[PDB]
Amino acid sequence: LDLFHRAVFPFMFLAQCVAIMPLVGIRESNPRRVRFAYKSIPMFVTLIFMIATSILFLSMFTHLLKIGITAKNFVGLVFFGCVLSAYVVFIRLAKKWPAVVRIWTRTEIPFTKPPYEIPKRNLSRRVQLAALAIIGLSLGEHALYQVSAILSYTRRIQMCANITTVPSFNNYMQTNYDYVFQLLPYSPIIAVLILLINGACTFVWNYMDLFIMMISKGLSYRFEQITTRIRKLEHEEVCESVFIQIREHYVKMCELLEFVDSAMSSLILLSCVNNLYFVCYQLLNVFNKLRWPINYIYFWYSLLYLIGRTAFVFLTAADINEESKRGLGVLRRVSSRSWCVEVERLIFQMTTQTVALSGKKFYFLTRRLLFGMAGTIVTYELVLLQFDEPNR
Amino acid sequence: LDLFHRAVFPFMFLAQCVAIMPLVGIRESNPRRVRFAYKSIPMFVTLIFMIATSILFLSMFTHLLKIGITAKNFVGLVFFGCVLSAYVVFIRLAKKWPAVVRIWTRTEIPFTKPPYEIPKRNLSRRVQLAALAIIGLSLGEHALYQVSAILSYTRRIQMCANITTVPSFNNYMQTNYDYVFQLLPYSPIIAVLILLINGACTFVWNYMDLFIMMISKGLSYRFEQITTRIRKLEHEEVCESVFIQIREHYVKMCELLEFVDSAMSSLILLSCVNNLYFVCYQLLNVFNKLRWPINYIYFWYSLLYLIGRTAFVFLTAADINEESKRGLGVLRRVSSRSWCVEVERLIFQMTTQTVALSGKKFYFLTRRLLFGMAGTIVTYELVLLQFDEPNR
Amino acid sequence: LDLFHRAVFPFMFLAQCVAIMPLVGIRESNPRRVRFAYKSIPMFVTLIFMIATSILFLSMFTHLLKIGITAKNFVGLVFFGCVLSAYVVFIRLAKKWPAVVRIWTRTEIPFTKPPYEIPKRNLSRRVQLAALAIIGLSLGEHALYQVSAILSYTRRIQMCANITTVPSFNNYMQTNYDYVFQLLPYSPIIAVLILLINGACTFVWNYMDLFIMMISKGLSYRFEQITTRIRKLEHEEVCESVFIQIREHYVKMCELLEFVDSAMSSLILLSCVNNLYFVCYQLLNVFNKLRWPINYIYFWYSLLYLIGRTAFVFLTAADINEESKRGLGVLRRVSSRSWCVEVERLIFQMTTQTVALSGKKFYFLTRRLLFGMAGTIVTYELVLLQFDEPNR
Amino acid sequence: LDLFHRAVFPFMFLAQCVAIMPLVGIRESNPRRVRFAYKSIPMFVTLIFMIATSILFLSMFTHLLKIGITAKNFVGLVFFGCVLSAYVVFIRLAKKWPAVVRIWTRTEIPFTKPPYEIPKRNLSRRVQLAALAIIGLSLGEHALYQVSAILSYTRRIQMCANITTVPSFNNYMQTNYDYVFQLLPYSPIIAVLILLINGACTFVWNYMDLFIMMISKGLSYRFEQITTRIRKLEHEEVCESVFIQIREHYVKMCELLEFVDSAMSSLILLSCVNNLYFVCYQLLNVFNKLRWPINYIYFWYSLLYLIGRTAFVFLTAADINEESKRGLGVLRRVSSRSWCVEVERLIFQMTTQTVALSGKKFYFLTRRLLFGMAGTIVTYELVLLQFDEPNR
Numbered sequence A, B, C, D: 001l002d003l004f005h006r007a008v009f010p011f012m013f014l015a016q017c018v019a020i021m022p023l024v025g026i027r028e029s030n031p032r033r034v035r036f037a038y039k040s041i042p043m044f045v046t047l048i049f050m051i052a053t054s055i056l057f058l059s060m061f062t063h064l065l066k067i068g069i070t071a072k073n074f075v076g077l078v079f080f081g082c083v084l085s086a087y088v089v090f091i092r093l094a095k096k097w098p099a100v101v102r103i104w105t106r107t108e109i110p111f112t113k114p115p116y117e118i119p120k121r122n123l124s125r126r127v128q129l130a131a132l133a134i135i136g137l138s139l140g141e142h143a144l145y146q147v148s149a150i151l152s153y154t155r156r157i158q159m160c161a162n163i164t165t166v167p168s169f170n171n172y173m174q175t176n177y178d179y180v181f182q183l184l185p186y187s188p189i190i191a192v193l194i195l196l197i198n199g200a201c202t203f204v205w206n207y208m209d210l211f212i213m214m215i216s217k218g219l220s221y222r223f224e225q226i227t228t229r230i231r232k233l234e235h236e237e238v239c240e241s242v243f244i245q246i247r248e249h250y251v252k253m254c255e256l257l258e259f260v261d262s263a264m265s266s267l268i269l270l271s272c273v274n275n276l277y278f279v280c281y282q283l284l285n286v287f288n289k290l291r292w293p294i295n296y297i298y299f300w301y302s303l304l305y306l307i308g309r310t311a312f313v314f315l316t317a318a319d320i321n322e323e324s325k326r327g328l329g330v331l332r333r334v335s336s337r338s339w340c341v342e343v344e345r346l347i348f349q350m351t352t353q354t355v356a357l358s359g360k361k362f363y364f365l366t367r368r369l370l371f372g373m374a375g376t377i378v379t380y381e382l383v384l385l386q387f388d389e390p391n392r
C-alpha cells in the first residue's frame, strides 16, 4: 500500500542492518508492531555498533590530541561525533517512532482515499528513486574514496616509500586507515570489522540527509495531494464542505509536520550543522590542488554530491512550504460566489504559518532559507579563503 | 495595437538576427503563428550560432586552462558560458513562448479596453525607448571596447612592440582577439565571422537584461493600468462589481506573472547571478589604475552602464511590486460605505502575496531586494578589496 | 498657532539666511503665500550662495586631484558635494513645498481641534527645543573645530614652523583653510566670505538632519495626538463614528507621510547616506590618536554629536512607526462590544502598512532599521579597521 | 502562595544582601509593602556598596589608563561599568518595582484560579531550581576563578618569583588583585572588604541574567498556563465566553509583558550587550592556550556557563514567544462550529504581535533572534580571529 512506512522500511531495514535507529519489528508491513524494546536483537546490534563507533571516535580523539587538533584534522572529530550523535538522536527518534509512525499513518489514511490520487510516482517509487540515488552516490563517494586511497597509495608505493612493500589489504589498513592501531591491536579480523564499521559510519553520515529527505518526501507527497485536489476544483463552484475538509486535512498535515519537527529537531539540527560544516569545508577546499586526477574526480564528485545533497534535502524540506504556498495561488483564484470564511482562514494560514520543517524553530527550511544559507556560505567562504590564504 | 508582442517583435526579430531564443514566425503581428518548429531557418541559424559560440567557449576554455584560470581570467568563462546558458534557457523559454505569449495576449486583451487607458507612453513606445537606450549603451560599451582596444594597441605599437607592424584588422585579430587561433586557423573570413559572433555574444549578454526589462515593463504597464483605474475611482463611491473586476484582473496579472516566472526562472537566475558577478567584478576593479584615459572612460562607462542596467532592470522588475503596492494606498482610502469584502481580499492579497518577479522563489525582485543586493555587494566588496589588496 | 509651518519658519528663515531651500515669503505666518518664484531676492541669494559653494567644491576637487583622492581626502568631496546636493534636492523640495505645506496644513487643521489636545510641549516648543539643541551642538561642533584649528596651529607656531609668523586671521586662512587659494586670489574680503560660506555649508550639513528631524517631529506630533486620543477611550465603550474618524485621521496622516516621503526621498537618502559615511568615518577614526587634548575633545564631541544626531533623527523618524504601533496595543484592548469592522481595518493597517519614513522605499525608518543600521555599521567597522589596520 | 513575588523574594533578599536593586520591605510576603524610600537601611547599604563599586571602577579606570586600555584590558572596564550600570538601572527598576509588582500580582491573581492549574513545578520551585542552578554555577565560576588564581600563583611562587614569599591572603591581595592599591592603602580590612565587593560585583554580573531569567520564567509560567488551558479544550466544543476570557487573559499578559519591557528595557539592553561582549570575548579566547589545566577547566567552565546562561536566559525569554505561539496551533485545531470572531482576533494577535521581551524594541527576544545572534556571533568571530590572529 502507498504508505510512508511501506516506503521507508526497505531502507529502514537496510539502516538497521548497519544498526541505525534501532527498532524491533521494522520489517513488518504494519506500523503498530514496530517498538523500542530492549529485549531482542536490534538494540544489541546497535549497541555493539555504537561501542564500535565509540572506540573509533575515542581512538581518533586521542590520536588527534597526540597529533594536534586543527581545522583540517577536526573533520574526523565532526564525522565520528556526528555519527555517534546521529546514533543518539536516532535512539531518541525511535523512542517516539512508534508514536511518530502511528500519527503519520493515522493522518495519511485519508490521503489514500478517492478524493485524492497518485499522479505518476507513488510514495513508494518517489521515495525509492531518490533514496536509491542517494545510496548510489553514497556508494560512489565511498567507492572513489577507496579508489583514490588505494591507487594514490600504491602508485605512491611504486615511487619511493620502500617500493618492496607489496600493496595489500593489511598494508592499506596500517597506512591509509590510521587512528585505529594506536588503541586497537593490528589484525585482519579487526581490520575487516573496521571496514564494516567505517562503511556503516559513512552510511550514518549519508543516511542522516537521506532520512531527512525521506521525511520531506513523505510530507511533500501528501501536500502535493492537497494541492492537486485544490487545483482539480479550480474553475468549478466549490462547496463549503469540500473547503472545510481540505482545511482539516491541511491542519492535520501541519499537525504531522509539527510532531515530526518535535521528534526530529535533534536530527534536523544535526544534519543542518553537519552539512554546513562539510559543505563549508569542501568549498574551503575548492581553490586548492590535489595529488592525482583520481583524487581530483573523487573530491569534485564529493563536492557535487555534498552540495547537491544538501540542496536537494533542503529543497525537499522546502517543498513542503512551496507546496503549501502553491495551493495559495489557486485559492486566490476563487470567485466571490464561494468564499464561505473557511477559504479566508486557509489563505491566512498558508500565508502566515510558514508551514515547513525547522531545526528547533531557529530557522524554517524554506527556499528563502536555502538562499540565505547560500549567501551565508558565500560570506563564510569570503572570510575563510582569507583565513587559510597563506596555507594554500 | 498596444500589445506586448507587437512591442517586443521589433526587438525579438533583431535578437533572432543574431539568433537569440529561436522561434518560427517572430515577424508576424499575431502571437499565435509563432512556434518552436525544427523545420525552418531559425533553429538552423541558432544552431550554427550556438556551435560558433561553443567553439569560442571551448577554445577559450582550453586557452585559459593552458594559461591558468584565475579570478581575472574567469571573466571570459562566465561571459561565454553565460551566453551559451542564455542560448539554452532561451531555447527552453521558446519551448513555452508559444504558450507564454498566448497567455500574455489572452490576459492583456482586457487591458486594451475602455475601462483602461494609455496615459502618455504606450507599451510600444515605453518598451521602445528603454530597449533602444539599452541597445544604444550596449553599442556604446562595445564601441569604446573596440575603441580602447585598437587605440591602446596601436598607440602601443608606436612605442616598442616592433613598431614596423602596421596597425591592421588582421593584426588586431591576432593580438587583441586571442583564445581563437590556438584552435581555429587564422583567416580574414574566420576573423570577420569572429567579430560577428563576438558582437552577437555581447548582444546575448546585454539582451539578457534587456529582455528581462522588456518583460518587467510589459507587466508593469498593465499593473500601472490597474493602479490608474484604482486612482480614477478615488473619491467616488465604487460599486462591488468594479472592485470584483479589478480583483479579477489583478489575479489574472498575478497568474501571468507566475507563469512568466516559471518560464523565466532560468533566465532570471542567470541574469541575476551574471549581473552579480559582473558588477562585483567591476566594483572589484573600481579602486585601480588603467593604462590610458580612453581605457578609463571605457571602463567607467562600462561601470555606469552595468550598475545602472542592473539597477534599472531590477527596478523595473520591482516596479511590478511597487505598482501593486501603490494601489494598496488608494484602496486604504476607501470609506466604510463600499467595503464589500472584495476590497478586503484585494488588500490582503497585495499586502501578503509580495507580487514580484523571482529567481526560483529564492528571492523576489523588489526594492527591498534591491537594497539588500546593494548591501550584499557592499559587504562582498569590503571582503574582496581585502582579497585582492596585494595585487593592486 | 500650533502649526508645523509656524514651528519651522523661525528655522526656515534662519536657513534661508544662509540660503537653504529657497522660497519667497517664508517669513509669513500663512502657508499659502510661500512660493517658488524666480523674481525676488531668495533664489538670487541661494544662487550666489550656490555658486560660492560650487567654487568651493570645484577648487577642492582640483586641489585633491592635484594631491590625490584618498579615503581620508574624500571627506571634503562628500561634504561639499553633499552640501550642493542638499541645495539641489532642497530646490526640488521647494518646488513642491507650496504643495507640501498646503497638504500638511490641510491635514493638520483637524489636529488642532477639541477631540485632540496639546499634552505638555506644543509643536512650537517641541520643534524649538530640539532644533535649538541641534543648532547649539552644531555651533559647538564648528566652535571647537575652529578652536582646535587655531590653537593647534598657533601652539604649533610656537614650536618650529617659523615662529616669527604671528598667529593672525589671514595666516589661519592661508594655512588651515586650503583648497581655496589655488583657484581664488588671497584677500581678506574673499577670506571673510569664505568663512561665511563655510559656516553656511556646515549649516547645510547639519540642517539636513535638523530638517529631517523637524519633519519627523511634525509627523510624530500628530501621531502622538492620535495615540493619545486612542488611549483616552481606553476603558470606555467607543462608538463606531469615533473609530471611523480616528481611522480617517490615521489614513490622512499616512497620506501626509507618503506625500512628504515622495517630496523628501532625495533628502532622506542624501542624509542617510551622508550620516552613514560620516559616522562610519568617525568610528573608523575611533581607535587612533590625535595631536592635542583640544583636538581630542573636539573629535569626540563631533563623534557623540554625529552618532547621537543620526540616532536621534532616525529615532524621531522611527517615532512615527512606534507611535502608530503604540495605538495598536490600545486597540487590542477593545472588548467584543465595539469591534465594528473599522477597528479590524485599523489594526490590520498599523500591523501591515509599516507606517514610517523611507529613503526611496529601499528601507523604512524604524527602530528595527536603526538596529539593522547599528549592526551594519558594526560589521563595516569590523572590516574597516582591517582595511586601515597598517595605517594606524 | 504561587506568586512571582513569593518566588523572587528568597532571591531578591539575597540580592539586597549584596545590595542589588534596593527596596524597603523586600522580605515581606505582600507585594504592596515593598517601596522605594530613602529613609531606611537598604538605600544606605546600596549607596555604600555603590561607592565601593565606584572606587573599584575608578581605581581600575586610572590603573588601566596608566597601563593602557586594550581589548584585553577593556574586560575590567565593561565588568565594573556594567555592575555600576546594573546598579543604576536596578535603582530605576525599583522606582517602578512597587508599580511593577503591583501590576504583576494584579494580573497574576486570575492565574491562581480553578480555570488554571499547576502542572508539575510551581512558579516557586520552577524559579528556585533555575535560580539555585545559576547561583551554583556562579559560585562555581568564581570558585574556580579563585582556584585558578591562587594555585597558578603559588605553583608559580614555587618556581622563581622569589620562592621565599609564603603564599598568603595578603600576598594574593597584593599580586592577583591589582587596580586597588594604587588608590586605596594596603590593609587586611580593606582586603576583606575588597573580596566582599568583588563577590558582590560578580553577583551583580550574574544576577543580571539571573533576574532576567526570573522575569522570563514568571511570564512563561502564566503563558504556559494559558496554553495548557487552550490544550485542555482541544477536542471539545468551546463556548464564546471561554474564548473571550482566554483572549482577555492573553491581552493582560501582553500588558504585563509590555509594562515589564518598559521598566526593564535598560536592564535587558544592558544584559544583552554585556552577554554579547563576554561571549564574544570568551569565543575570541577559544582558540588559544592557557597556563595550567586548572586554568583550562576554569576558563572552559566559564565558557559553557556564559554561553549556556546567555542561551538559557534568552531561551526563557523566547519561551514567552514560543508559548504564545504554541497555543496558536491548538487554536488552528478549532472546528467551524465555534469560531465566534474572538478566536480570529486571538489568532491574528499571536500571529502578528510577536509577543516577546525586547531590548528597546530594537530586537524581540525570540528563538529566531537567538539564531540570528548565533549567526552574528559566528560572523563576529570570523572577523575577530582575523583581528587577533598575530597575537595568538
Ligand SMILES: OC[C@H]1O[C@](CO)(O[C@H]2O[C@H](CO)[C@@H](O)[C@H](O)[C@H]2O)[C@@H](O)[C@@H]1O
Residues within 6 Å of the ligand: A075, A076, A079, A141, A142, A145, A177, A198, A199, A201, A202, A203, A302
Ligand atoms: O577521516 C575519518 C574516516 O572517515 C573518512 C573521512 O571522515 O571517510 C568518511 O568520509 C568519506 C567521504 O564522504 C565517506 O564516504 C566515508 O564512508 C566516511 O567514512 C575517512 O577519511 C576516514 O576513514
Ligand SMILES: OC[C@H]1O[C@](CO)(O[C@H]2O[C@H](CO)[C@@H](O)[C@H](O)[C@H]2O)[C@@H](O)[C@@H]1O
Residues within 6 Å of the ligand: B075, B076, B079, B141, B142, B143, B145, B198, B199, B201, B202, B203, B302
Ligand atoms: O573576454 C572574452 C571576449 O568578451 C569580452 C569580455 O568578456 O567582451 C565582452 O564584454 C564587452 C564589454 O561589456 C562587450 O561589450 C563585448 O561585446 C563582449 O563580447 C572581450 O574581452 C572578449 O572579446
Ligand SMILES: OC[C@H]1O[C@](CO)(O[C@H]2O[C@H](CO)[C@@H](O)[C@H](O)[C@H]2O)[C@@H](O)[C@@H]1O
Residues within 6 Å of the ligand: C075, C076, C079, C141, C142, C145, C177, C198, C199, C201, C202, C203, C302
Ligand atoms: O574639509 C573641508 C572643509 O569642511 C570641513 C570638513 O569637511 O568642515 C566641515 O566639518 C566640520 C565638522 O563637522 C563642520 O563643523 C564645518 O562647519 C564643516 O565645514 C573643514 O575641514 C573644511 O573647512
Ligand SMILES: OC[C@H]1O[C@](CO)(O[C@H]2O[C@H](CO)[C@@H](O)[C@H](O)[C@H]2O)[C@@H](O)[C@@H]1O
Residues within 6 Å of the ligand: D075, D076, D079, D141, D142, D145, D198, D199, D201, D202, D203, D205, D302
Ligand atoms: O577584572 C576585574 C575583576 O573582575 C574579574 C574579571 O572582570 O572577575 C569577574 O569575573 C569573574 C568570572 O566571571 C567573576 O566570577 C568574578 O566574580 C567577577 O568579579 C576579575 O578578574 C577582577 O577581580
